[PDB]
Each structure stands twice: as C-alpha cells, then as structure tokens.
DNA sequence: CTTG
DNA sequence: GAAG
DNA sequence: CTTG
DNA sequence: GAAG
C-alpha cells in the first residue's frame, strides 16, 4: 500500500519533519529595529490547560526551547497557541513575495496531463531550521503557575505568525525539489508552500512520479499527510479549485 | 446730488420696478411634467403675523395676485415669506447656465479703468414679468383665520426660490443694456443679475457715465439702492472683492 | 488580547 | 463616532 | 417644514 | 446609522 510502502514520507509513520539539506535560516531585521518586549496579557486557567500540552509537545520535540531574550510577543488562546508576531514583523526586513497566486500557479497545467496526485506537507514550517542567532526574536512567556516555571521560551524552527514564514518555505522547497524535476522532466509539480500538485500523462506515470515524489520528500525530511492525500486520481481538489478534465 | 438729479432710477424715490421693455416671461415645462400640489404646512401664529404685512404689500404692488392652480408649494417662515420651490423646479425645463462667474468676470476689468461706480439693483427679479400662463407655477396659499380669507396667491413678476431666475435676469438685463454699452464705449460695465459695476479712466468721464447709466436704468424701469450706491471712486467693494489700484 |  |  |  |  502507499502507506507501509514509504514509511518515511508520511506524517503519520515517519516522525516530525526537519529539512536536513536547508542551512538554519537567519532572519534580517530592518535597519534601525530595536528588540520590543511585549507583557503577556493574563491567561485563565481554562486557556492554559487548553494551550499546556501542544507546549509539552513542542518542547518535548525540541521544536520550543527555553529562552532569555529582550524581545517578547503575546500568546493568544483561539484551544491552540496563537502568537501575535505583529511587533516582531515590522521589524524584520521585507523579502520579495515569490509566491505565486493559485489563479497564475494553475496556468502551467496543461491539457494532456490529467492523472494527479496531491500532497498536503504537514508542519511545513516546523520543518525548516532557525538560526540560533535568529531564535530570541520569537520569544514568548510560558508560566505554569502550579508547576512554578515562569520565564521564555521560543521557537527553534519557521513559526507560525511570521509574515515571511510562507515565502521562506516555498523557497527552500524549490531549492529542496529542483533535483526531482530534472531527473522528471515528464511531470508537472506545482508547488504552493505545503501544497503540492504532481500531475502526469498516464496513471502509470502517475504511480512512479508519485513514488518517486515520496521517497525524495521523505528522504529530504518534510512529511505528507496521509489522510489527505489524493493519489492518483483524474479528480482532485488543489487549492479551492475541483480539478476535472482539464477544468479550472 | 445724485439721490435729486435722478429720482426715477433710485428705488427710495422711484417706486417699485417694472422692466416695461421685456416681454412677461413664459417659463416652458420638462416633456413630462404634470402639475404638483404640496400641502402647506400649519403656520404658527407668530409666523403668520410676520409674514402677513409682506403678503399685504406684495399684493397691493400687484405683485402677488389671487389665483386658483393645480400647483402648490409650502411657505415656510424664516419673518420674511420664503416658498419652497424645489418640486416646481425639478419640473421646468433646464436652460444653459450663462451668468459668468465672479472670478472671470472680474478678469474684463482692465487696469486703465481705476474709477469705479457699483450700483445693486433693488428688488430686481420682480422687475421681469411673468406671463400669465406661467403665473399658475408659482402658486402658493394663503389663509388669514381671523379675516376668512383662505385660497391660493401667485407671483406676476419673476420669483424668489426658482431656479431660472438669475440667469433670466441676467439675460434681461444684458439686452435692455446693449445699447447704453454701445453708446459709451470707452466704458466697463460688469454685470452679475443684480450688481453692476461701471469703470471708467477719470473721475470725469466715471461721473458721465454713471449719469447716463442711472438715467437708462431708470427709464428701463430698474431702481438702484441709493443706500447701498457707490458712485465714482477709486475703491470699490464688488462681489465680494475689494477693488483697489487694479487689485483683485 | 490588540490592531461599514 | 478579521487576523496575529 | 422637507430634502461627517 | 445648508438651502428652498
């Protein structure tokens, strides 16, 4: 099955991701920003448990890390950890955004491939590296009032809330695939940071890419959900659009 | 003095105004307009005695008339009788905007011409005519309580409040004026409906003139404020500019 | 929480 | 006077 | 009166 | 949600 054939590339069997062949990325800041640190507003006791162990995990992972640091960003509970990164953001210099819109991304399907495969990349973020020197600008306070731990801690991987956190992993996949599309000059693989679409001539072609579009993205260690995966079909959802005979 | 040598033209000695040489105006309608009565709204007491000594003279010049119409507009008080007309002129035909403004008229005034007489002409829509076939427009009512005179009245002359009247004033005006310009062609005469101002290059020639206008302007059946005159100097206040040594 |  |  |  |  396409399961227990590439243990490695799913989620659900290969572990968390880590993208081992991308350098930890350092993050520029404007010229002229200073570290800003930000007092956590009060959280009840409800959105604390609620939040404490997607943190156990996290730290467990070693995706969060014990900290201290001169900059500091609320948590909000939405329960799941939400981090107002807005006063970091407007510090951090501008990249150019290389995302394309889906509308363009989806102009280079052509007609004669029909047969796709999608793939949805799990905690795509969590999978690149951060600098240590770039670590202490995501920092956040963790306090367990009946475990008396109060201080920092932060984020050793891309976090969530960073405004340029989509463009750098879309970047570091291209980088990360460019082999593969040499080596399958007949596919096409459209990217759209965590959402792949492998699209093929033949369902034949469609298995081997598709296998081989596995092993790679395990091998390089980003991770593919396997309950949302869409193998193989001459129908698929990608990025809002129902995909069918060379509709939409 | 000036108020003695022309008793016809000034409107303290001359009597009401009448443009005998203009024919009664006929006001065309919009293609589609049918007649529209508006209920007068209940007048207090107060406003009523306020108005009333207006309404009485009004009728005795003949320049208000009782009628039967199947127009009607409101009186409102504000004491001095103001008619809404706003129904009335959304049902008359459009005509080309032609009275210049006060910025580019005052552009015709050449620096040769620093003496100056600005007259403003008194009552000066009611010097036009109305035909009788236009006077059921205008129609309003009026009801004194305490004398059992309730029924409509309606304008002869040219009214307060319709859109029309300025510039068919100003047109008027401009052809009952065209041959006094051709007679005195060393002279500026600017005209804005009611406000005139006559330019001349010496005092002498100024005093001429002002002679000759006010002796046509009155003949015409036009009155000029006495009060207000402004005769043959070298500073004038003219539509709201202050004229002086050939500045704004 | 704050930032038609 | 919805989003981090 | 009603029509920033 | 100032003007006739």
């Given at each position: ?39 956590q ?39 799941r ?76 991987r891309?976090?969530?809330g ?62 593919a ?24």
């Amino acid at each position: 099955t396409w399961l227990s054939d590439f243990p490695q590339a799913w989620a659900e069997t290969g572990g968390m991701g880590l993208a081992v062949r991308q350098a930890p990325l350092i993050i520029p800041l404007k010229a002229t920003s200073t570290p800003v640190s930000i007092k956590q507003y009060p959280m009840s006791q409800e959105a604390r448990l609620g939040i404490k162990p997607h943190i156990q995990r996290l730290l467990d992972q070693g995706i969060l890390v014990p900290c201290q640091s001169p900059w500091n960003t609320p948590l909000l509970p939405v329960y799941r950890p939400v981090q107002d990164l807005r006063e970091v953001n407007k510090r951090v210099e501008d990249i150019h955004p290389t995302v394309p819109n889906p509308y363009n991304l989806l102009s280079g399907l052509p007609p004669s491939h029909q047969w796709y495969t999608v793939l949805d990349l799990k905690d795509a973020f969590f999978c690149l590296r951060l600098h240590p020197t770039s670590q202490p600008l995501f920092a956040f306070e963790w306090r367990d009032p009946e475990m008396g731990i109060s201080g920092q801690l932060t984020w050793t991987r891309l976090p969530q809330g960073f405004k340029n956190s989509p463009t750098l992993f879309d970047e570091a996949l291209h980088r990360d695939l460019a082999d593969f599309r040499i080596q399958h000059p007949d596919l096409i693989l459209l990217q759209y940071v965590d959402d792949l679409l492998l699209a093929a001539t033949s369902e034949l072609d469609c298995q081997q890419g598709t296998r081989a579009l596995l092993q790679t993205l395990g091998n390089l260690g980003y991770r593919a959900s396997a309950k949302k995966a869409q193998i193989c079909q001459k129908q698929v959802k990608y990025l809002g659009y129902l995909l069918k005979e060379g509709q939409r």
